[PDB]
C-alpha cells in the first residue's frame, strides 16, 4: 500500500539513496524509504541530519497474532508503512529529527 | 473526516458516553471520541480503565503557521483525530492504557 505513496523509492540502491538526499544539500529532514537489500524483506528510512546520513531499518514485530511495523524495537508500533511515515513527519520520536522533506520519486 | 469513523459519537453528553463505557463492564481499553461540551470546539477522548472512566481533552496546537491536535501539551502531534487514534490503539503513550475496543455508534 505504501508502493503508492511519493516518499517511497521501490528497490534504490544505499548508494542512490545516499546521492539523491546529498543533492538534496544534506539538509536536517530530507528523507526517504525503500526496500531492505537484504531478506527477508524489511523496508529502511534514510534521512539527512547534522550534515550526515542516517539509515533506519523498519522491521516487523509480533504481538498476540498481529504484525506491526517498527524501527524502535517495537516501543513505538505501527500497522504499515504509511501510518508509521507520518507519524514521524509531525514526531521525531527516537529520530534525530523530523522527516520534513521527502525526496521526489 | 473523523465523522465517518465507528468510535466517533457525534455530540452525546459525557454523562451518555459514561453510560456506554460502563455497560461494556469497564474492560480496559474500552472508548470513544466525542465533540466537546465546552466552546471553542476541541474533541474529548473517552475510555475506561483500572474500573474507572478518564476523559481526556484532544487540543488544537500552532506550529508554524500549522496546526495540530494533541491530547499531551503537543509531545506527541497529529494532524486530524485518525491520526490520533488509530495511534494510540496501537501505542499507549500518556494514556493508561491503548485503546482496545470502540463503543458501537
Not at 16 to 40: C, H, W, Y
Not at 60 to 76: A, K, S
Request: glycine share 6%; charged share 25%; proline share 4%.
Amino acid at each position: 500500500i505504501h508502493r503508492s505513496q511519493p516518499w517511497f523509492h521501490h528497490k534504490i540502491s544505499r548508494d542512490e539513496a545516499q546521492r539523491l538526499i546529498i543533492q538534496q544539500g544534506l539538509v536536517d529532514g530530507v528523507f526517504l524509504v525503500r526496500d531492505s537489500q537484504s531478506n527477508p524483506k524489511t523496508f529502511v528510512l534514510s534521512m539527512s541530519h547534522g550534515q550526515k546520513i542516517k539509515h533506519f531499518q523498519i522491521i516487523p514485530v509480533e504481538d498476540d497474532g498481529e504484525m506491526f511495523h517498527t524501527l524502535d524495537d517495537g516501543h513505538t508500533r505501527f500497522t504499515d508503512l504509511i501510518q508509521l511515515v507520518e507519524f514521524y513527519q509531525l514526531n521525531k520520536g527516537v529520530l534525530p529529527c523530523k522527516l520534513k522533506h521527502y525526496c521526489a520519486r
